[PDB]
Amino acid sequence: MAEALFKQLDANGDGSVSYEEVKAFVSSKRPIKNEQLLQLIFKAIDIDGNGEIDLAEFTKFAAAVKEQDLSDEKVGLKILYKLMDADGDGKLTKEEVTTFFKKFGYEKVVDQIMKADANGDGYITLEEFLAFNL
Numbered sequence: 147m148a149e150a151l152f153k154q155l156d157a158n159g160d161g162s163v164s165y166e167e168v169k170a171f172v173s174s175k176r177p178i179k180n181e182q183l184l185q186l187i188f189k190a191i192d193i194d195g196n197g198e199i200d201l202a203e204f205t206k207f208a209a210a211v212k213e214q215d216l217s218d219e220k221v222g223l224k225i226l227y228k229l230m231d232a233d234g235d236g237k238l239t240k241e242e243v244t245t246f247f248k249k250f251g252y253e254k255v256v257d258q259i260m261k262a263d264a265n266g267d268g269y270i271t272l273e274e275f276l277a278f279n280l
């Protein structure tokens with residue numbers, strides 16, 4: 147008398163879908179509040195050309211982050227992104243990033259960076275950067 151598999155939840159058997167549905171499905175179990183922040187991050191963590199992810203993508207990603215020889219490498223530039231961020235205070239402004247990312251070795255990114263943001267921030271936060279290379 148128990149269950150734990152998005153399989154049914156989905157049923158569609160399409161494998162992929164809008165985690166949003168899984169975010170709520172789970173949110174109505176152990177958690178309660180987070181489906182938002184998550185769903186959000188996820189939605190952005192996707193943008194692979196739709197917005198519908200697959201339990202696999204999530205799981206794989208988890209097993210991908212689990213590995214102790216990949217993230218760390220980035221963690222470094224990350225910890226630096228947060229530290230170096232003395233003016234940003236959390237978000238790195240074009241100039242900031244451009245210079246930072248460039249000082250780090252992402253001059254060719256400056257292009258995607260400037261073309262990355264353009265909604266209502268004009269800057270790039272830790273995530274953002276990590277988003278470009280997630």
Ligand SMILES: [Ca+2]
Pocket residue numbers: 192194195196197198199200203
């Ligand atoms: Ca996808």
Ligand SMILES: [Ca+2]
Pocket residue numbers: 263264265266267268269270274
């Ligand atoms: Ca932005």
